[PDB]
Amino acid sequence: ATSSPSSPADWAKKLTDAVLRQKAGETLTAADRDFSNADFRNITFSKILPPSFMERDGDIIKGFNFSNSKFTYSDISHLHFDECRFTYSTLSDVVCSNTKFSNSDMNEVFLQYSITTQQQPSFIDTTLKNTLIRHKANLSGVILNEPDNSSPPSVSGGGNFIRLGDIWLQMPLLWTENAVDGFLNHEHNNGKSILMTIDSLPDKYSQEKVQAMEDLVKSLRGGRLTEACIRPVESSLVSVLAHPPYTQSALISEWLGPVQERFFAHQCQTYNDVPLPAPDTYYQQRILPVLLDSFDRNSAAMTTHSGLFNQVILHCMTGVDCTDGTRQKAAALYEQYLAHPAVSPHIHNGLFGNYDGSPDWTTRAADNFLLLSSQDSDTAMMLSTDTLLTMLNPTPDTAWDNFYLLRAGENVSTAQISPVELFRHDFPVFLAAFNQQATQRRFGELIDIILSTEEHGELNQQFLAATNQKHSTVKLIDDASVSRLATIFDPLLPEGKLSPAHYQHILSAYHLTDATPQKQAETLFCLSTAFARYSSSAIFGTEHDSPPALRGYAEALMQKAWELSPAIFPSSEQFTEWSDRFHGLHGAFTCTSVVADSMQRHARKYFPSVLSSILPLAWA
């Protein structure tokens, strides 16, 4: 009868029958598709529907009436609903990863869905009149209407409500560290945030977008925090609000002014003397234009912070995802830089750019970059776009002699002076890049000692590759991996302790053969933290499984450090507690990237110089 009024199981079964007949080619009457008042509470639909219903471009649930239904706590992930009515339904705490709703009426529904949801749901040609939605959704295809007179939905707790067209969004009550992250930080939340949600609306609704954003900014201002609390999300904020159509809002623009200045000042403090991590698509499209704008508003910072300035310009010119406008603006700003009294002297007729005191941006081999010294007024470096790229993001085989040293209107000789020494005194960003290359080289050498390239090519390459990313798709927890790793690490750990021979190899690789017991211990501590990270859920381990061979090796590194110089440790049983969590007494079921976190925190506190010189940068 397309019907049944019993349990959730009974409802779900009638729906599956109807949807299967639909798939069979049968045309169902409106009576057959009437699931008004349906009880679908706690149903996992993937367990009751054929696989085709959850696949990309698979089967779809078309033309059903689910008025005033209960989907509470159910799992509708990866389903596609087309031409359905959800009016008055409860979808509170529903798992809806990548669920699509198209051509549907989802008016007056409760849609604060479960945070266990992975992919945002998306809404195409669908109305959400007076609907309370969680602030993470793809609204690229929603239909908006003029808001009515109604009161915000009745709710148990939380903050005030804002309109997004005729949709309701709930604000947090306070903007705590937790709320700031959950609402604003799309950078640390896989591209999801209220900022991205409001911004996903079609361009025909630019008015509604600005209005909703103004209301959020009002909430934010209405008891804002400080620099410590806004700091984690300054980047996410400017990534969206420093672009049209939010630029046309007098209210947003006024608020954003100080936020962007703080953001810019922070970048100047962090990346003037340290290489900016190679910008990805997001950074090139949303952040670089903001940095250009800040330099445009504070032209003095171009020469005061030429380390950061030159990096930004470089990435604007070479990023595959930068707009033409971004490149042109970068070039225009660079011209102002070159016109500066402190820079113009160094522009040397026979070597710079097109040779007429302007760069040649049509080629990467032209020497278009001049970098002022951080210490001496009269000295500069000149190099090509190609060279600067490689010196900022060094590779194992990058040379540090492909630049021109300028001074006194002359191309000076760089023979009989090591790049290191020049960088230390005059070019801090390159000292950092040089040290990064060195640190990577030495860690690589240790990898080669442990994992020979001739026997374990695949693993050596993976161990090497894992050092340049925060996360890994490679997990060494299958039987073959565990067996192979046991073969590599265990033989270096007789009785669970570092072999004396292996310890000497470490000493030679890190040139500590003549060093103090302390510097030796601190180095071993940091290496122990590195291998603890390898074994964590982020790299080669999962959340519930951490390769025992990697844990044993990290533990023994820490033991030898303790033997060498116990005073480097904070306590007797602090050493014991970490040792215990490295070990699998069979009572440790799940977790620790915790040992790595705790140990690393201690390293930054007491020997942050040793840590930075040992740890791969991406893991810092």
| Peptide bond preceding 245 in cis form (omega within 30 of 0) | yes
Query: Which superfamily does 158-352 belong to?
Result: Putative secreted effector protein (1.25.40.300)
Q: Which residues pair with 412 in a beta bridge?
A: 405
Residue 110: enclosing H or E segment and its boundaries?
strand 110-111
Q: Is 401 helix (H, G, I), strand (E, B) or coil?
A: coil
Q: Which two tokens stand for residue 464?
A: 């090497």
Q: Which residues pair with 141 in a beta bridge?
A: 124
Q: Which two tokens stand for residue 72?
A: 């509470």
> Nearest-CA neighbor of 483 among 432, 549, 385?
549
In angstroms, the CA 96 to CA 78 distance is 7
In angstroms, the CA 307 to CA 459 distance is 37
261-267 contacts: CB < 8 A, separation 24 or more? 261/294, 261/297, 261/298, 262/227, 262/230, 262/231, 262/234, 263/234, 263/235, 263/237, 263/238, 263/290, 263/294, 264/290, 264/291, 264/294, 264/295, 264/298, 264/301, 266/231, 266/234, 267/291, 267/308
Residue 80: enclosing H or E segment and its boundaries?
strand 80-82
The segment(s) of the chain belonging to CATH 1.10.4140.10 are: 428-620
Length of the chain: 620
- Residue 69, phi then psi, degrees to nearest 5: -90, 165
The segment(s) of the chain belonging to CATH 2.160.20.80 are: 1-157
Read off the DSSP letter of residue 65: B
* Class of the CATH-defined domain 1-157: mainly beta
Residue 591 annotated among the catalytic residues of the structure: yes
C-alpha neighbours within 13 Å on the C-beta side of residue 451: 16
Q: Which residues pair with 85 in a beta bridge?
A: 65, 105
Please provide the distance, in angstroms rounded to a whole number, between the alpha carbons at the two ends of the chain.
Answer: 63
C-beta of residue 371 within 8 angstroms of C-beta of residue 380: yes
The segment(s) of the chain belonging to CATH 3.40.1850.10 are: 353-427
In angstroms, the CA 114 to CA 533 distance is 31
In angstroms, the CA 179 to CA 241 distance is 19
Q: Which two tokens stand for residue 291?
A: 């940095």
CATH T-level fold of 428-620: effector protein (NleL) fold (1.10.4140)
Q: Which residues pair with 371 in a beta bridge?
A: 381
User: Which residue's entry shows tokens 């087309």?
Assistant: 82
In angstroms, the CA 171 to CA 352 distance is 54
Given CA atoms 419, 423, 424, 425 in this order, what sign does their dihedral have?
positive
Q: Which two tokens stand for residue 594?
A: 């915790």
In angstroms, the CA 176 to CA 483 distance is 47
Q: Is 6 helix (H, G, I), strand (E, B) or coil?
A: coil
- Residue 353, phi then psi, degrees to nearest 5: 45, -120
In angstroms, the CA 295 to CA 278 distance is 20
DSSP-assigned letters across all residues of 159-209: --EEEETTEEEEPPSS--HHHHHHHH-STTTTT-SHHHHHHTS-GGGHHHH
CATH T-level fold of 353-427: HECT-like ubiquitin ligase fold (3.40.1850)
Read off the DSSP letter of residue 149: S
Cα-trace Rg, the chain: 30
In angstroms, the CA 170 to CA 159 distance is 6
From 268, 316, 526, 591, the catalytic residue: 591
- Residue 493, phi then psi, degrees to nearest 5: -125, 60
How far are the Cα atoms of 106, 107, 153, 160, 170 from residue 156, in angstroms, in the given order?
22, 20, 10, 12, 12
